[PDB]
Structure 1
Amino acid sequence: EKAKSRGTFQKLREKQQLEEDLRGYMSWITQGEVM
C-alpha cells in the first residue's frame, strides 16, 4: 500500500500499455512492408 499509493501503479500500467501500443504500432508497419 505504501508503494501503490505513492507512485508504483503507473510504472507498471504505462509500460504495459506502451508495449501493447508499440506492438500495435509495429503491426501497422510490418503489414505495410509486406503488403
Structure 2
Amino acid sequence: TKEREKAKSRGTFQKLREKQQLEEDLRGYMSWITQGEVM
C-alpha cells in the first residue's frame, strides 16, 4: 500500500481510467460503422 499510494498519486489513475474508457469508445466508434455499412 505504501509503494502504491505514493505513485498512485502520480500517474497511474490517469493512465488506466482513460485507456479502458477510450477502449470502450474506440469500439464505440467502430460499432456504429459496422452496423451502418451492412444494413
The two structures have a TM-score, normalised by structure 2, of: 0.78
Gap regions ≥5 residues in structure 2: none
The two structures have a TM-score, normalised by structure 1, of: 0.84
Percentage identity across paired residues of the two chains: 100
Moved segments of 4+, more than 3 Å = none
Equivalent pairs, count: 35
Structure number with the bigger relative contact order (C-alpha 8 A, sep ≥ 6) is 1
Pairwise CA RMSD: 0.8
**Structure with the higher helix share, 1 or 2:** 1
